[PDB]
Write a protein that binds this ligand. Sequence first.
Ligand code: URI
Ligand code: NAG
Ligand code: NAG
Ligand code: NA
Ligand code: ZN
Ligand code: ZN
Ligand code: ZN
Length: 267
Amino acid sequence: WGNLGHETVAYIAQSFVASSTESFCQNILGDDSTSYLANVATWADTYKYTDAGEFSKPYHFIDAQDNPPQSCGVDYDRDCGSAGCSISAIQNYTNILLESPNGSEALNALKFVVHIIGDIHQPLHDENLEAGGNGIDVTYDGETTNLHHIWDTNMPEEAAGGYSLSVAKTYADLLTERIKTGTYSSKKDSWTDGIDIKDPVSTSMIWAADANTYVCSTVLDDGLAYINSTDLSGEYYDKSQPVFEELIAKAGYRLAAWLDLIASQPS
Ligand SMILES: O=c1ccn([C@@H]2O[C@H](CO)[C@@H](O)[C@H]2O)c(=O)[nH]1
Ligand SMILES: *[C@@H]1O[C@H](CO)[C@@H](O)[C@H](O)[C@H]1NC(C)=O
Ligand SMILES: *[C@@H]1O[C@H](CO)[C@@H](O)[C@H](O)[C@H]1NC(C)=O
Ligand code: NA
Ligand SMILES: [Zn+2]
Ligand SMILES: [Zn+2]
Ligand SMILES: [Zn+2]
């Protein structure tokens, strides 16, 4: 996602974490504001453009070698690759926070987990084709862009009504309502099925496989004749909106559950 999506995921997670988890994270981050997670949710996307952070570019995605829209699937050993991936990064940084939460690596580990659980839920961050859709040029509201970009940025910002941290907070409030009582309230009690702090790869692969299903059902189902030729800000946006909104909600809910397990200690 772009910055709005990551901040929204982070604000949702803040609304679901336990108090002890909030304290654990505020202490690592040195921030006890009501934006503590949202304030770091974009860091990984700045870091990756620096020499020191170049290593971490592959950690934003897992290039699933499926065949969409005909067939979708993610396989860790087939798709992660030698340079690592979102799944291998969740394992590494989760294990740093479990083993060394008071050490110097904890700060970046937590900022990576906040960001990357967001990225796992962007379907085109779970797809090899055309570098996650970066190579598919499209038109969106009269502008030339690419399919990856409209899922990261154009469509979420249209739905949220802007791009800023305050707009993200409002959007997160809307999606948090949908989880607690609204649209998602009868399905969210299944969203953490299979979660296992002792198996970060298995857990994050469930999430990535869930998001990847939408590459076939939603991202690419219209077929590339349509996608290449049609302004996607109309009916394509209309069908995409419920899907990316539910995936942003899932990302925040699952991030909170994961942070609770990372911070958890038996009383
Ligand atoms: O296979 C790829 C290649 C790139 N990206 C993402 O696409 C962004 C560029 O739009 C990059 O920063 C990167 O995180 C993916 O999700 N998958
Ligand atoms: C784990 O994270 C550290 C710090 O960012 C990095 O140096 C190391 O290469 C990572 N290891 C793996 C297996 O991804
Ligand atoms: C759509 O554009 C992509 C990327 O250039 C291309 O691979 C594909 O063949 C195009 N499909 C159609 C039917 O135009
Ligand atoms: Na056209
Ligand atoms: Zn992102
Ligand atoms: Zn992206
Ligand atoms: Zn990212």
